[PDB]
Amino acid sequence: LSTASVLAFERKLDPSDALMSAGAWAQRDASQEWPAVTVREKSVRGTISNRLKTKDRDPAKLDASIQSPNLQTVDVANLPSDADTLKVRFTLRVLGGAGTPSACNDAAYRDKLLQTVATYVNDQGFAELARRYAHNLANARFLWRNRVGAEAVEVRINHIRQGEVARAWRFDALAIGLRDFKADAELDALAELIASGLSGSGHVLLEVVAFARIGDGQEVFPSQELILDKGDKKGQKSKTLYSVRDAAAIHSQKIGNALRTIDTWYPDEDGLGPIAVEPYGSVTSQGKAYRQPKQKLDFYTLLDNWVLRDEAPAVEQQHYVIANLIRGGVFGE
Amino acid sequence: ILSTASVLAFERKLDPSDALMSAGAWAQRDASQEWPAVTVREKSVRGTISNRLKTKDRDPAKLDASIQSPNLQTVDVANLPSDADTLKVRFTLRVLGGAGTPSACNDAAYRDKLLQTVATYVNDQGFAELARRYAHNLANARFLWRNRVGAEAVEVRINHIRQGEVARAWRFDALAIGLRDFKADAELDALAELIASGLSGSGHVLLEVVAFARIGDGQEVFPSQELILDKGDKKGQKSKTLYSVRDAAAIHSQKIGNALRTIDTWYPDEDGLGPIAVEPYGSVTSQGKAYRQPKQKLDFYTLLDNWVLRDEAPAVEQQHYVIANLIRGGVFGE
């Protein structure tokens, strides 16, 4: 038995684009008619503040560079001048059937993989993974820079059966820490619901609303788009923000990156907090890959040892491997 | 061995908002909440030729024929109403905290050395000096750039906001406080203690700043000026463009934040010529020159690399400069 040359898993925990709207705290309960946050433009001139490569470090060339115009246009999203609360609303489906691939050559391989995933789901629930996922919904990881420096964040999660709410949670995203996966009662109810979604035992749809109290006219942070560089005189646009029909917005995959930041089991540390579930789990901001393949805790090494050769790894690394299967991805050679 | 991170990036602390401008009467400024905003509106203008000509176009037929064809332009102007002499400028400010910690770093040994360095700073010398100077720049009205020039009465009002209600209010005379002389006060040092509490994570600082500037009935206010995609259009279209938010004239947030970090008196030219803004390479654009060259050794990158990599701590004043650059933020690294 060997690996299939094609494996492909579809993602569970399938979120929507979060849309941003602004208003007043303690009108927070009536945040249904709040106007959107519009991506706008302003002009920018900067000065020379990057490093110099010691051949542009002559003083006359530097002063000629400073006398040069350095203009460009950027996109900004701010709250209004009479609105101090940011509202961020997305939805989320938990699907389940989280070990069945969607494109698999080798029929013996997918049989032994389903045996292994079914063994996991038999002797352990999706209980730890749903506990961790419901933490990352309970705090406001999906408010990336919008949470940074906010004085009051709260999260409102409504489970939706029809055009109607089954159950409503209301959390306090600053009391629920960014590090400690603690214990709570309503959070354990949400973890039971997400674990019933991941196991295949019900329909899970969430309405995740989060309110960050920021300040009047302060800047909010939609996720940034991708533009190509040209040599336009006196400023081509240097920054594009993402939006929908005239409303600033966060990409769905950035929210989904916040929700699968449950990995505290990597060999470096766990006082450094959870990192996101990636094969050979890498952080792009810190520029390095935790969980290298040569120090054998990689997803591919653990999966090859555990499916092809029956070497069951440690329990926490099994949580990591099943978290990669809930993530989805393009596997195989 | 230790080397610099090939990617460094710091998020800005002390981040202001856009300053919306409104107008009314002095001694009505104690109820200045429903003042109408200064609106940007267009007017025609028609100059003559006044450029410094070369020594080829100074023939009298050419110059007279240039006067024969005048330049017709549309500009936009922001004035006060003709029965309103006080300019109100209002913005909020957040002093975040966590200054030395980068937001992108390739080399996690360099990251720990930089964090040890900033913690050695904050433990030895707090944010007292920096917040004292930033409180000067809030207390005088630098963020009124040309709105302040020639005004006779500037009054700054800074509130602190815990929930939508005022924790503590300050009032100032921004012309009694200098533009150059960092003197000592008591309310200003209370504001400095608040900002130094904010800069080190010890608390929450949100500051509603309002600056009244009595100018004169009908006079001109100066919002910040936008950029044009003028594509050689027909016979002088709109050439000057001002900034507004919702038909209400405004200043950019980065121009205000420039005015807040005009702290740097430590550049090797003179403290006597007054403070410049805390940039790397000390670059002042209107002067056209770089104070604090990298050829001399008071640059941000030279001081930062000597104080982080090679353990050579600079003078205390240059430590205030380097920590103020980290509060500024920016894309450092190669």
Short mmCIF file of C-alpha atoms in Angstrom, two decimals, chain A residues 6-117:
data_model
loop_
_atom_site.label_atom_id
_atom_site.label_comp_id
_atom_site.label_asym_id
_atom_site.label_seq_id
_atom_site.Cartn_x
_atom_site.Cartn_y
_atom_site.Cartn_z
CA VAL A 6 -4.34 12.37 -6.01
CA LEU A 7 -6.00 13.28 -2.72
CA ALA A 8 -8.30 16.25 -2.27
CA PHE A 9 -10.41 17.25 0.70
CA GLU A 10 -13.09 19.90 0.64
CA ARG A 11 -13.09 22.43 3.43
CA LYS A 12 -15.43 22.21 6.35
CA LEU A 13 -15.96 25.34 8.47
CA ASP A 14 -16.96 27.24 5.32
CA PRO A 15 -17.40 30.94 6.17
CA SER A 16 -18.70 33.90 4.21
CA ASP A 17 -17.15 37.29 3.58
CA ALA A 18 -17.56 39.48 6.63
CA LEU A 19 -19.15 42.81 5.89
CA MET A 20 -18.44 45.91 7.94
CA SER A 21 -20.94 48.44 9.25
CA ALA A 22 -20.68 51.15 11.89
CA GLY A 23 -22.77 52.74 14.59
CA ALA A 24 -23.16 53.54 18.29
CA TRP A 25 -22.57 51.18 21.20
CA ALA A 26 -25.80 50.55 23.18
CA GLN A 27 -27.58 50.96 19.89
CA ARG A 28 -25.64 47.70 19.46
CA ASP A 29 -28.81 45.67 20.01
CA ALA A 30 -30.55 47.37 17.06
CA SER A 31 -27.62 46.90 14.66
CA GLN A 32 -29.72 45.79 11.74
CA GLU A 33 -30.06 49.12 9.96
CA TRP A 34 -26.50 50.32 10.52
CA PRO A 35 -24.94 51.88 7.41
CA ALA A 36 -21.96 50.25 5.81
CA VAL A 37 -18.32 51.24 6.06
CA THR A 38 -17.42 52.63 2.66
CA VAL A 39 -13.95 52.21 1.19
CA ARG A 40 -12.83 55.72 0.33
CA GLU A 41 -9.69 57.39 -1.06
CA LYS A 42 -7.25 59.98 0.12
CA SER A 43 -3.91 61.25 -1.11
CA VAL A 44 -0.56 60.47 0.46
CA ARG A 45 2.93 61.82 0.11
CA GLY A 46 5.68 60.11 2.06
CA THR A 47 9.34 60.75 2.53
CA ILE A 48 12.33 58.47 2.12
CA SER A 49 12.33 56.12 5.09
CA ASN A 50 13.46 52.74 3.77
CA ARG A 51 17.01 51.52 4.22
CA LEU A 52 19.65 52.69 1.75
CA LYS A 53 22.07 50.33 0.03
CA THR A 54 25.24 52.39 0.86
CA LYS A 55 25.55 53.51 -2.78
CA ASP A 56 22.56 55.84 -2.47
CA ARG A 57 23.79 56.93 0.97
CA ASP A 58 25.68 59.92 -0.42
CA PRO A 59 24.17 63.12 1.05
CA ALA A 60 23.49 65.00 -2.19
CA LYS A 61 21.68 62.04 -3.76
CA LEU A 62 19.61 61.67 -0.59
CA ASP A 63 18.65 65.35 -0.58
CA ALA A 64 17.77 65.16 -4.28
CA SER A 65 15.59 62.16 -3.44
CA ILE A 66 13.88 64.08 -0.63
CA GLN A 67 13.14 67.05 -2.88
CA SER A 68 11.43 64.62 -5.30
CA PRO A 69 7.65 64.14 -5.21
CA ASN A 70 6.57 60.83 -3.72
CA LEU A 71 2.81 60.87 -4.08
CA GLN A 72 0.30 58.04 -4.43
CA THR A 73 -3.34 57.31 -3.66
CA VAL A 74 -4.52 54.86 -1.00
CA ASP A 75 -7.83 53.37 0.05
CA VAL A 76 -9.04 53.98 3.60
CA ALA A 77 -11.99 52.75 5.62
CA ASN A 78 -12.93 54.73 8.71
CA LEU A 79 -15.89 54.83 10.98
CA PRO A 80 -18.05 57.95 10.69
CA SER A 81 -17.45 60.94 12.91
CA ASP A 82 -20.45 60.05 15.09
CA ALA A 83 -20.01 56.26 15.21
CA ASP A 84 -17.62 54.46 17.53
CA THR A 85 -18.57 50.78 17.13
CA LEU A 86 -17.55 48.52 14.26
CA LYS A 87 -19.97 45.72 13.40
CA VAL A 88 -18.56 42.69 11.57
CA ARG A 89 -21.07 40.06 10.45
CA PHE A 90 -20.41 36.81 8.62
CA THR A 91 -21.96 33.34 8.52
CA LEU A 92 -20.43 29.89 8.88
CA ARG A 93 -21.36 26.33 7.90
CA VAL A 94 -19.96 23.24 9.60
CA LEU A 95 -20.40 20.29 7.27
CA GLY A 96 -18.94 17.04 8.55
CA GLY A 97 -17.84 13.91 6.82
CA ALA A 98 -14.40 15.25 7.55
CA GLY A 99 -12.21 12.38 6.41
CA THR A 100 -13.84 11.42 3.15
CA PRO A 101 -11.83 12.80 0.22
CA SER A 102 -13.32 14.22 -2.94
CA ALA A 103 -10.77 12.97 -5.50
CA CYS A 104 -8.89 9.76 -4.71
CA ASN A 105 -7.19 7.40 -7.17
CA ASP A 106 -6.24 4.56 -4.87
CA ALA A 107 -9.30 2.78 -3.52
CA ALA A 108 -7.33 0.79 -0.93
CA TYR A 109 -5.78 3.98 0.41
CA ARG A 110 -9.12 5.70 0.92
CA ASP A 111 -10.47 2.59 2.64
CA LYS A 112 -7.64 2.54 5.16
CA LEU A 113 -7.91 6.31 5.57
CA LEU A 114 -11.62 6.02 6.33
CA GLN A 115 -10.83 3.24 8.82
CA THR A 116 -8.28 5.49 10.54
CA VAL A 117 -10.51 8.58 10.66
#
